[PDB]
Amino acid sequence: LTEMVKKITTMNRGEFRQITLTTELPRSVIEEIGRHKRVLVLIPLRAAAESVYQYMRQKHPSIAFNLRIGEMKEGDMATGITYASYGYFCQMSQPKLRAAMVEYSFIFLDEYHCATPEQLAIMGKIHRFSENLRVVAMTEFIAPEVMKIAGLKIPVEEMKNNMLVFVPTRNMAVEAAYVVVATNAIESGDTGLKCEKRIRLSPKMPFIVTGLKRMAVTIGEQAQRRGRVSQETPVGSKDYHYDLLQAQRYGIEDGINITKSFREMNYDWSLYEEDSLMITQLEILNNLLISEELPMAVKNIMARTDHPEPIQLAYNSYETQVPVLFPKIRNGEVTDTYDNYTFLNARKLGDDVPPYVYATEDEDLAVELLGLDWPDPGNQGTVEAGRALKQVV
Numbered sequence: 001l002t003e004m005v006k007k008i009t010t011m012n013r014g015e016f017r018q019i020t021l022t023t024e025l026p027r028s029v030i031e032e033i034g035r036h037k038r039v040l041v042l043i044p045l046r047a048a049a050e051s052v053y054q055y056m057r058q059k060h061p062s063i064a065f066n067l068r069i070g071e072m073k074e075g076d077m078a079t080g081i082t083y084a085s086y087g088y089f090c091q092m093s094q095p096k097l098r099a100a101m102v103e104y105s106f107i108f109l110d111e112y113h114c115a116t117p118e119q120l121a122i123m124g125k126i127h128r129f130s131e132n133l134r135v136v137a138m139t140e141f142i143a144p145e146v147m148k149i150a151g152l153k154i155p156v157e158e159m160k161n162n163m164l165v166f167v168p169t170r171n172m173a174v175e176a177a178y179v180v181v182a183t184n185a186i187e188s189g190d191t192g193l194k195c196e197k198r199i200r201l202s203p204k205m206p207f208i209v210t211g212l213k214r215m216a217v218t219i220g221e222q223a224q225r226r227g228r229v230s231q232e233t234p235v236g237s238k239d240y241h242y243d244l245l246q247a248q249r250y251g252i253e254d255g256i257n258i259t260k261s262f263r264e265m266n267y268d269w270s271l272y273e274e275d276s277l278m279i280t281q282l283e284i285l286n287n288l289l290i291s292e293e294l295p296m297a298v299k300n301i302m303a304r305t306d307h308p309e310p311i312q313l314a315y316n317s318y319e320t321q322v323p324v325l326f327p328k329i330r331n332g333e334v335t336d337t338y339d340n341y342t343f344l345n346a347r348k349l350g351d352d353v354p355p356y357v358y359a360t361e362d363e364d365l366a367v368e369l370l371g372l373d374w375p376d377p378g379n380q381g382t383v384e385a386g387r388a389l390k391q392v393v
Contacts, residue, residue, distance in 0.1 A: 001024070001025065001028060002028075004019060004025065004028075005025070005028045005029055005032055008025075008029055008106070008136055009029060009032050009033055011106075011134045011136075012134070013131070013132060013133060013134055014130065014131040014132065014133070015134055015135075016130065016135050016136070016137070016268065016269055017135075017136045017137070018136070018137045018138075018139075018269065018270070018271065019136055019137065019138045019139070020138075020139050021138065021139075022110060022138040022139075023041075023052055023055075023056065025108070025138070026039055026041050026081050026106070026108050027056070027060060027063060027081070029106060030063060030080070030081055031063070033105060033106075035062075035063060035064065035079070035080070036079045037079070037105045038077070038078070038079060038080070038082065038103060038104045038105055039081050039082070039104060039105055039106045039107075039108070040081075040082050040084060040101075040104040040106070040107045040108065041081060041082065041083050041084070041108040041110055042084055042085070042086050042089075042107070042108065042109050042110055042119075042122065043083060043084070043085055043086075043110050043111065044085070044086060044110075044111050044114045044116050044118070044119055045085065046069040046085045046087065048111075049067065049068075049069050049083045049084060049085045050067060050069060050083075052083050053065055053066075053067040053083045056081070056083070063080060063081065064078070064079050064080025064081070065080050065081050065082075065083065066078040066080055066081070066082040066083065067082075067083050067084070068082055068083070068084035068085070068088045069084065069085045069087075069088055070088075071091075072088075072091050072092060076100070076103075077103065082104070085118070086116065086118040086119045086121075086122045087118040089101075089122050090118050090121060090122065090250055093253070093254055094125065094128070094254045094256060097125060097126070098128075098129045098132070101126055101129070101132075101133060102129070102132045102133065104133075105134065106134050106135075106136065107126070107133055107134065107135045107136070108135075108136050108138060109123060109135060109136070109137045109138065110138050111138075111139065112137045112138070112139055112271055113139050113220065113237075113238070114238075115238060115240035115243055115244075115272065116243060117243050117244075117246040117247040117249070117250070118247070118250070120240065120243055120244055120247040120258070120262055121247040121248075121249075121250035121251065121258055123262070123265050123269075123271075124247075124258050124260075124261030124262040124264070124265045125250070125251075125256065125258075125261060127261060127264060127265030127268065127269070128256075128261060130265075130268065137269060137271055140226075142230075142231060143230060143231075144231065145230070145231060149165060149176065150165050150166075150167050150172065150176055150181070150191045151191065152191065152230055159179070162178055163178070163179040163180065164180055164182065164186070164228055164229075165179065165180065165181040165182070165191070166182065166183075166184065166186070166190040166191055166217075166225050167181055167182070167183060167191050167193070168183070168191060168193035168194050168195045168214045168215075169183070169195050169214070170183060183195075184217075184221070184225075187224060187225075187228070190217075190222065190225045190226070190230065191230055191232070192216060192217055192222070192230035192231075192232030192234065193214055193215065193216065193217065193230075193232065194214070194215060194216075194217045194221070195212050195213065195214055195215075196212065196213060196215055196239075196242075197210055197211065197212055197213070197242040198210070198211065198212075198213040198215070198239065198241070198242055199241050199242045199245055201278065201281040201282065201285070201389070202389065203386050203387075203389035203390035203393065204374075204386075205319075205355065205356070205357060205374055205375065205376055205377055205382070205386060206356040206357055206358055206359035206364070206374060207281075207285055207357055207358070207385065207386065207389060208245070208285060208315065208357065208358040208359065209358075209359050209360065209361060209364050210242055210245070210309065210312075210358075210359075210360055210361065211360055211361025211362065212361070215235075215239075216232055216233065216234055216235050217234055217235075218234055218235050218236070218237070218238050219234045219235075219236060221234070221238075222234045237272070237273045240272065241275070241278055241282065244258070244259065244262060244282060245282060245311065246309065246311060247262070248286055248289060248311060249310065249311050249314070251286075251290065252289070252290060252294060252314065255290050256290070257283060257286045257287055257290060258286060259279065259282045259283040259285075259286040260283055260286065262279075263279050263283065277392065277393070280392050281389055281392055284385055284388045284389055284392065285315070285357075285385060285389075287385075288315075288318060288357075288381060288382070288385045289311075289314060289315055291318075291381055292318075292381075294314055294317065295317060295321065297321065298313055298314060298317045298321070300343070301313055301323075301343045301344065302314060304342060304343045305341050305342050305343045305344060306341050306342050307341040307342075307344065308341075309360075311358070312358045312359075312360075315357045315358035316354070316356050316357050316358055318357055318379070318381060318382055319354070319355035319356065319357055319375075319377075319378055319379070319382060320354050320355055320356070322345075322346065322347055322354070323344040323345070323346040323347075324346055324347055324348070324349055324353075324354040324356075325338045325339070325340060325344075325346045325347065325348045325349060326338075326339075326349045326360075326362065326363045326366045326367075327348075327349060327366055328362070329362050329365055329366060329369070333369070334366055334369050334370060349366065349367075349370075351370070351372065353367055353372045353373060353374055353375060354375070355374075355375040355376075355377075355378050356374065357382065357385075359374075
């Protein structure tokens with residue numbers, strides 16, 4: 001640790017170090033450079049931030065500690081180690097963010113492999129002035145599958161023991177249901193699977209289609225599941241493309257292309273695996289997103305809706321200002337049920353499909369099932385994004 005600390009503490013501004021082990025490290029660093037110096041530690045979850053803050057301030061009285069998980073503390077100059085969430089810094093404009101960030105001697109990006117939208121936006125954004133910073137990024141039974149519990153062959157003798165069954169979907173957890181069949185959301189408060197959002201990009205409009213997908217859990221997630229006490233191989237790396245798309249919301253007001261910032265940061269810091277074609281397509285779409293000032297009406301809706309992906313509203317506004325209500329899909333069939341989110345003031349699908357730039361898996365499915373067709377780009381900007389996407393392929 002004294003090696004790591006000596007390497008960190010000799011760092012010049014405009015330098016970067018990636019470390020693999022992560023909380024006694026910032027402590028050693030501050031004790032080395034001076035207790036009145038300022039050092040920032042970025043943590044994904046607010047709960048995780050508060051938890052470290054508490055743990056550290058109790059364990060290390062003599063070292064000042066700060067917590068930033070709420071409202072922007074204007075003119076903040078708290079000496080000691082500051083534990084903040086990436087989301088805290090998401091409230092400030094680029095200039096405010098830079099002014100805030102350069103006031104820290106060291107910046108520790110903890111658990112960067114989570115790749116949350118707040119994390120991805122902050123890393124791309126601060127990398128924009130990385131020359132002014134010193135940043136350090138920090139990071140048994142095999143059951144067979146059943147043929148003609150959760151699709152796995154488990155001995156009946158194990159039912160006499162206390163069981164936790166990890167399952168990917170909400171439906172599977174109830175259908176199979178001491179024995180508790182719980183989703184990954186269980187740990188918050190193994191089938192090797194999980195349900196996460198994924199994205200598909202194409203030159204054909206809607207260029208973006210997002211939806212839940214059953215996938216393999218990561219080695220980290222498998223470790224978390226095993227830590228509570230299938231033949232499915234875990235992924236080394238989580239897919240951050242949805243998250244990167246959601247992260248784009250954080251550059252709208254500043255007119256910053258988050259996708260370009262991510263790509264440029266990652267080229268310098270080499271923190272994530274890259275899918276060049278996907279990043280390129282996401283970047284073309286990102287340029288479109290910020291090509292014009294967002295209509296005030298759309299800004300307000302995005303701010304007030306309970307819609308799960310308000311960025312969809314921002315993208316679609318390049319074609320339509322009226323949100324559409326697609327009939328819900330229960331059991332592979334189109335129902336007469338609708339998902340209505342607040343402030344949209346939407347019209348129902350009917351037989352008139354909206355010129356969506358950004359759609360959901362289910363919105364696409366309803367269109368297909370009904371035998372309808374998605375319109376084509378209606379304007380030069382949208383037509384041009386499409387040609388650019390085709391060219392990139």
